[PDB]
Design a protein around this ligand. Structure first.
Ligand SMILES: [Mg+2]
Ligand SMILES: [Mg+2]
Ligand SMILES: [Mg+2]
Ligand SMILES: [Mg+2]
Lengths: 559, 49, 49
DNA sequence: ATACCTCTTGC
DNA sequence: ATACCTCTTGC
DNA sequence: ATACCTCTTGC
DNA sequence: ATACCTCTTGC
């Protein structure tokens, strides 16, 4: 029935028991420079809460949903894999929402034309630790001398696990607390699994072989980073980090192979208004001057005519490939979009995000179903397979069935397939763009692969750091023991129930550039209205939510 | 830490830390005790014991 | 030779020697020859060959 | 008197 | 023109 | 007081 | 350590 004793505070220049060590700031600054450059500084802070780990051990676990895949035709459902599980927790902040609110986004997006990522740093403070002790009256006392541990993997020794890919970054609301996630990482494993269908006879091999001892790697924080111990008075801070990576644009393109170059001169123009009064080239298709890449005909049509190269490309879908560890969907860059979609035509390439209350779902809404959406980029660089086709070289037309392959004809005798599903047109002439950011649920920057050769882009984030990326930040509560402890014993050790709270504050800097009017007509711009109006404000209860928004609004020539 | 020098010498620095736990002694005294497993050796052929 | 430097770089120098033997050419001429295993491919299904 | 959709490859 | 199983009892 | 799996983007 | 809804009555 004691308060513990209240203990007394000694005082240095950067801290003590009853001395704050930090300052809260989650404010965003725009600073206009000469020539239309802007320096955007975004501050962000949060109160973070964290419990002691389940157990102070590292574990090696295997996951096995064999049963589900055992089904036949449920290949895609495979979740098998191995992983190391640590006692540490990770503080990840890589995600649009952590840093900006809508108002901000708006601005950026409407007035700028390109954006560069500059630097970033973070710090922790006002640390606090309390212990619970318990008729179920729970009491809480500060444990003045206990500690919080912190480690920053600046060397990037640990494997990299961006958490946004699972919606586990921090929260997006400055005024409400949040937490870090428990850290874990992939551990190697061999695995086989033969695809099958409903109609498939017997049991296609489906097994977990084990682990290529060659491929083994087991890391630990303890052995690789220096751990800091903070007490309340303590505080920690990373330096400032600078990024090396390309800029990101905020404009989208729209021309496709069809709109490149000099359109054909029309010998004949309409003479009155009306949406049926077309113009006419006025020349026999087989009599026109110009250039093609087709040696046989004399036809020259908007679809035949030569273009300098090729925007976009086509690839297989839905493709699953498989290697040593099981199958996985083959990614695309492009996505699709347009008039012939409307989220329902929604296909391959468009990404889809799913998430919780901490990241956008309405706070007050009950029921644990995740909120979702499919981002549909503005950039018209994807494909409409249905429109594709292939024909015989003789090119005698109108064309015969025997000389043409359609998205309609079935391949391999399977009805619901056609060449477009296994087609691929990437090649030296291909040209395209990087994905666009996705607010607020998009990852912001990402690490590059350590392969000898490399992707030309990643699909999860727009900024890929060329060199090293900022090291991960882990934390964890220091074990607080009871008076009984026998390491020699097999049992798990008992600890005092302990937990901690601390504030975290970060600063992320971008640099961008104002855009300027070039066309006569105005352009698209994000804006509020009666329809969405409520998405941007709390409910009479404090309901909040963050809807997704687009990024590359304005157009730009492609050529 | 491994730190490679000229001529193939290395300087290995090994750090190590632990959380140590410790209870108060059974008694704040120094004692002088004798241990006697006479019985066991009493056996004959159990010298080693 | 392996020569260890600062910072764990090594300079590997590999020497190698041989006694080489060589006869006079068959003929002091340059020739332009064609090779033709038509027969083998003539087979049908032996493209690779 | 042409520089990456302005001024402005200026200053 | 030999130095402790290399270069290198050099530099 | 984060640099490309150590020390060490130090010296 | 308060200046006209940011940074910044700073520089
Ligand atoms: Mg360091
Ligand atoms: Mg290093
Ligand atoms: Mg092997
Ligand atoms: Mg292997």
């Amino acid at each position: 029935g004691s308060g513990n004793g209240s203990g007394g505070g000694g005082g240095g220049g950067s801290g003590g028991v009853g001395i704050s060590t930090g300052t809260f700031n989650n404010q965003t600054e725009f600073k206009f420079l000469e020539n239309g450059w802007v320096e955007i500084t975004a501050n962000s802070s949060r109160l973070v809460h964290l419990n002691m780990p389940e157990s102070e051990n590292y574990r090696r676990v295997v996951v096995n949903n064999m049963d589900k895949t055992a089904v036949n035709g449920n290949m895609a459902l495979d979740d098998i894999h191995a992983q190391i599980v640590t006692p540490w927790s990770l503080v990840d902040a890589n995600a649009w929402g952590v840093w900006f609110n809508p108002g901000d986004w708006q601005l950026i997006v409407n007035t700028m034309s390109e954006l560069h990522l500059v630097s970033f740093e973070q710090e922790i403070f006002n640390v606090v630790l309390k212990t619970v002790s318990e008729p179920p009256t729970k009491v809480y006392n500060n444990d003045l001398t206990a500690s919080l541990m912190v480690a920053l993997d600046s060397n990037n020794t640990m494997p990299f696990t961006p958490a946004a890919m699972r919606s586990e970054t921090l929260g997006f609301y400055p005024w409400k607390p949040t937490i870090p996630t428990p850290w874990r990482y992939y551990f190697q494993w061999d695995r086989t699994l033969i695809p099958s269908h409903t109609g498939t006879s017997g049991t296609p091999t489906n097994i977990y072989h084990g682990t290529d001892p060659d491929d083994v790697q087991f890391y630990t924080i303890e052995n690789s980073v220096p751990v800091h111990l903070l007490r309340t008075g303590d505080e920690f801070a990373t330096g400032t980090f600078f990024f090396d990576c390309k800029p990101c644009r905020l404009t989208h393109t729209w021309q496709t192979n069809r709109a490149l170059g000099l359109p054909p001169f029309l010998n004949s123009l309409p003479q009155s208004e009306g949406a049926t009064n077309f113009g006419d080239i006025g020349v026999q298709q087989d009599k026109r001057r110009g250039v093609t890449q087709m040696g046989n005909t004399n036809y020259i049509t908007e679809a035949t005519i030569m273009r300098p190269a090729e925007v976009g490309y086509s690839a297989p879908y839905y493709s699953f490939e498989a290697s040593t560890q099981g199958p996985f969907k083959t990614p695309i860059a492009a996505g699709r979009g347009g008039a012939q979609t409307d989220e329902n035509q929604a296909a391959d390439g468009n990404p889809r995000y799913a998430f919780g209350r901490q990241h956008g779902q309405k706070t007050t809404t009950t029921g644990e179903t995740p909120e979702r959406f499919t981002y549909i980029a503005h950039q018209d660089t994807g494909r409409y397979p249905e429109g594709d086709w292939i024909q015989n070289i003789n090119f005698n037309l109108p064309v015969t069935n025997d000389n043409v392959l359609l998205p309609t004809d079935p391949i391999g005798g399977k009805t619901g397939i056609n060449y477009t599903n296994i087609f691929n047109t990437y090649g030296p002439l291909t040209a395209l763009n990087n994905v666009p950011p996705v607010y607020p649920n998009g990852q912001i920057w990402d690490k590059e692969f350590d392969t000898d050769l490399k992707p030309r882009l990643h699909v999860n984030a727009p900024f890929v750091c060329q060199n090293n990326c900022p090291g991960q930040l882990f934390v964890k509560v220091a074990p607080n023991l009871t008076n009984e402890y026998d390491p020699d014993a097999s049992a798990n050790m008992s600890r005092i129930v302990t937990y901690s709270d601390f504030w975290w504050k970060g600063k992320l800097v971008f640099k961008a550039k104002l855009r300027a009017s070039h066309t006569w007509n105005p352009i698209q711009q994000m804006s509020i209205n009666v329809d969405n109006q409520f998405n941007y404000v709390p409910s009479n209860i404090g309901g909040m939510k963050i809807v997704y928004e687009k990024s590359q609004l304005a157009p730009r020539k492609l050529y």
